[PDB]
C-alpha cells in the first residue's frame, strides 16, 4: 500500500 | 515495493522540527517586537508587509511541536479532531500569507524604485492596508477547502491514529485521487509558482533600474551597488531554493501516482517529503534576516528592542 | 452681500410635482448646511428638510416624506427641493436657511425672501401660548415659550432659537441658542431664560420691533417650530 | 451628541479629508533649495529654470512638480531658519568659477571662491543635510576659461594649482569642492559645468532629483 | 561719513545705557517675596498644580 | 579718538549698571524659597492627541476661552482646534508655508501668522462669507517673523529676524513704533497681562523690556551664553522666563532687573525651543530638543515632571488662560493636551 503523504506531516496536499 | 523504512528519518524529523521552532519563534519574536515598538518613528513603507510576513511565520511555526510529536510517536495523533483541523488551517494560511507578503513586498519595491514619478499614486492607493487585507482574505479563502477534509481516526486500527484528509466527506473514492491531483496542482499554481513569477519579474526590473543609477564609478558607489545587487539575489533565490524543493518533490509524487514512477526512487521520493518540509520551514526562519533585518536602521532599531 | 433667492412655485394640481430651486450668492455655499422651512398662509413656520455641507446627512420631516427630496449642488451654488405629490397641506411660503456648525457658530444665521406655492382645490412641542400682545413704544415687553422636553444638553448649552418675522419680511434670527445675539441685530433684543420654559426681553421697543416672534428647538432633528406671538402696536 | 455636535464632527471629517488630500498632493512634489555664495549666477540660474523675503519657483519638467526656495535675500542668522529646509531633496549650490583671479573685491585678503569654499563646507556638513544631496553648479565657466587663458591658476591656488589648461584647472577645483564632503556615503555631490547659453541644466537638475528620489525610496524600503 | 555714523551710533548707545542706568531698583529679596506671595495666593486655583476632580475636568469627562 | 572716549563712557555706564545690580542682589530666590514645601512630582497624561497636521508644528497659541486653539506647520495650514472634542473648527491655508509663529487674538476674531516671508498676515475668523479671509498683510520687516502677539483687534506687536520689533496698526498698515535696540536676531516676545510693557529676547543672549506706548528699551537682561529662543511673562507682569540653546532657562525679574533663578540640569545638553508659565506661576514648562517637555518648579529650581511622549523636538507649548490644560506641540506633527 502506498502512503498518501497525508497521514504524517502538516501541509496536506 | 513501498514499505517506507528509514529509522534515521523517523528519529531525525522531530529534532529538526523542534530546531526550526526554537529558531523561527524568536526570529519572528524580535521582528514583531521591533516593528511594533519602533514603527511610528521609522514610518517605513515596508513595515506593514514585513509585519504581515513576521506574523505569518510566527503562526507558521507556533504549532510545530504537536506535529513533531505526531511524527515521533510513529503517527498516533494524540489530539482532537478539531485541533489538527486548526493546526492545518494555521500552517496553510501562514504558507499562503508568507508567499503573498513576499510578492507584495516585491510589488511595493517595484512601484517604489522602478517608476517613482509615474507610479506613486498607484503605490499609495494599492500597496498598503488594502493590499494586505486582500492578501490575507485570499489566503484564508484558498485554505478554506483544507479544514473541509481533515478528520481523525485510525485506518489500520492497530492504535495508529492519524488525521489524514478524508476526501470522502466531499466526494467518492473513485474520483478521489483524480481530484486531489487537481486540487494540489491548483495549490502549486497559487503557492510557489505565481508569487515567484511576479517577484522575479519585478526584482529583475529593480536590478535593471538600479544598476544604472547606483553604478556611479566611485569606490563607495561600487560597494553600495554590489551590496544591493547581491542582496537582490540572496533575497529571491532563498525563497527559490527553500520552496521549490517542496513543490517539486510533491508534484513528482503526484505525477508518479498517475505515472507509475519506478520504485528505484521511492525509498527517498517517499521520505524526502519530511526533508523538503523542513527546508520550507527553515525558509520561514530565514525570511526575518533577509526581508526585514538587513537594513542597518532596522538593525539598530532591533538593538533598541530588549 | 449675502443673498439667497428662491425660485419655482405658484399653483400645482393635486398630486403634482414641482422642484423648488434656491441659488446662493455672497457666501461660501459649500461650507453651509442648507435648509427648507415652510409657512402656512396664515399659521406659523414648519421645518421641511436639511442637507448638510458635503451632502452627508439628509434629514426630512415627518409630515413630508419621500415625495420631498432635497439636493445640493456645491458648484453653481444652487439648493434644490423637489416633490412628487402635493397634498392640500403643502401650500406654504417656503423658506431657505443657511446653517453652519462649529463650536461658536450661529446656526440659522440667514434666511431668504421665499417663494409661493399654492395647491388647487415624540417631537418636542413648542407652544408659545401667548398670541397677541399690545405694545407701546419704549415699553419693555417679554415673550414666553415652553417646550415639551428640557433643551439643556450635556454640552452645557440649550438649543432654543429665537426669530422675528416682520410684516411682509423674511424671518430674521434674533438670538441663537438661549440668548446669544446674532449678527446685525440691535442689542435691545436681549434673551435670558432657563429650564424648559424660556422668556424674552425687548427693552426699548421701537417701530422695527413689531411683528411675530417664533421659537425653534435644535436639540432633536424633527425641528419643531411654534405658533408665534404677534406684537400689535397699541 | 446633539445635532449641532454631530454637524461639527462632520465638518471636522470634511476638514480632515481636505488636509489629507493636500498632504498627498504635496508629498508628490519636490522641494529644492537654491542656496549658494555668489548672487551673480544666482539670478541667471533661477531665471533660466523658471523659464522681500523667501522667493518661490514652480517649474514642471517631465511631469515633476518642482519648487525651489531661493533664500539669499534673508541676510539673517542662518542657524535658525535652515532647520526648516530639512525635508529638501537637494540643495542647488551655485558658485562662481570666475572668482579665480578675483579677491571678492570686499575683503581684499580672501578669495570669493575661498569664502564660498567654507560656505559649502558648512552647508554640506550641516546636521540637517546629512542625507541631502547637493547639486553643485559652477557658473561663469566662459569667464573662467578666458581668465585661465589670460593667466595661470597658481595665483588663486599657490598650493599646486595644476596646469594652465582650463580642463585641468576646472577638474582640480571640482575635486577641491567634492572632497569637502566628509559624508561621502550618505549624500552625493552632483557637479555640473554649465554654460551661460546652456539649457541642459534643468535636465541635469531633473536627473539628479530622480536619482535622489530613487535613493530615498531605497532607504525608505529595506534595501539600504 | 562712516565715522560720523559710528559717532552717532556710539552716542545713542551711551544715551540708552544712561537711561537704563537711571532706572530705580528694589531688592531681589523683595522681588522673590512678591513672587512667592503671588504663588501662595493663587496656589488654590491652579488646576495643573493640584488636579481637579474628573467631573470638573473639561478633558477627563 | 573720540570714538574711544565714547566707548570708554559706554563701558563706564555698563560698569555702573552691573554695580547697581550687584548692590541690589542682597539675597537669592533659591535661598528665599528653600523653606517652602516642595511641589512634588506632577505626572501629566495626554488627554487629547490633536492629529491632522502633516509637517513640523512650528507654533501654537491658546484662545481666550481656554478651549479654542490655533496651530501652524510647514504644510501651510493654520488649524483652529476644538480641544474638547478634537474637532477642527477651521483650516486656513497660508500664503507661504514657512510659518514660525501664530497668534490668537484675545477677542477671538483674528489669527495672525508669519515666518520666512517677512509678512505678518492677519486672518478674519468671523465673517458673513462663512470662511476665513486674510484681512491684512503687515509687511515692512527685513527679517523673518519669529513671534507676533495681539494687543487688541487693531494692534499687534511683531518680533522679526532683523533686530527690529514692531508695533502695528491693523487698520492703517503703517508701523506705529520702531523698537530698534537689538544687536542680533530676535526670536521670542512676550506680553504683559496689562499690555503696556512687552519683553523680548534675541540672539545676542539679551532680553529687552520694551515700553509700548512710546517706544523705548526700558531694561536689558544679560546672562545667557547663547541665543534666547523662548520667552514668557509671569502671571503678574513683574517677571519673565527665557530659554536658550545653552541647555538652561532663567528667571528674570523686572523691578530689580537681575536674574533670579536658573533652571538647568546636567543631563540636559539640548536647547530649549518653547517656554511657558502656569497659573500662579509655580510651574515653568519648557520644550526641549531632547523630544520631551519638562516641568520646572518656578520658585525652586528642581525637577517636577517630564511631559514625555513627543517623537521629535518640542517646538511649541502653551498653557490655557484658566490653567486647566497644557497644550504641547512638536516637530512630529502632533499636538498633545496635558492635564
Author numbering:
A (entry chain D): 1 to 13
B (entry chain R): 19 to 324
C (entry chain S): 1 to 121, 136 to 248
D (entry chain A): 5 to 55, 182 to 354
E (entry chain C): 34 to 94
F (entry chain B): 2 to 340
Tell me, in the authors' exact words, what the paper reports.
The apelin receptor (APJR) emerges as a promising drug target for cardiovascular health and muscle regeneration. APJR has been extensively studied as a drug target for heart failure and cardiovascular diseases, with two endogenous peptide ligands: apelin and elabela (ELA)9–12. The formation of the APJR homodimer occurs through a small, hydrophobic interface at the junction of transmembrane helix III (TM3) and extracellular loop 1 (ECL1), facilitated by the “FGTFF motif” (human APJR residues 97-101). In this study, we present the structures of the APJR dimer and monomer complexed with its endogenous ligand apelin-13.
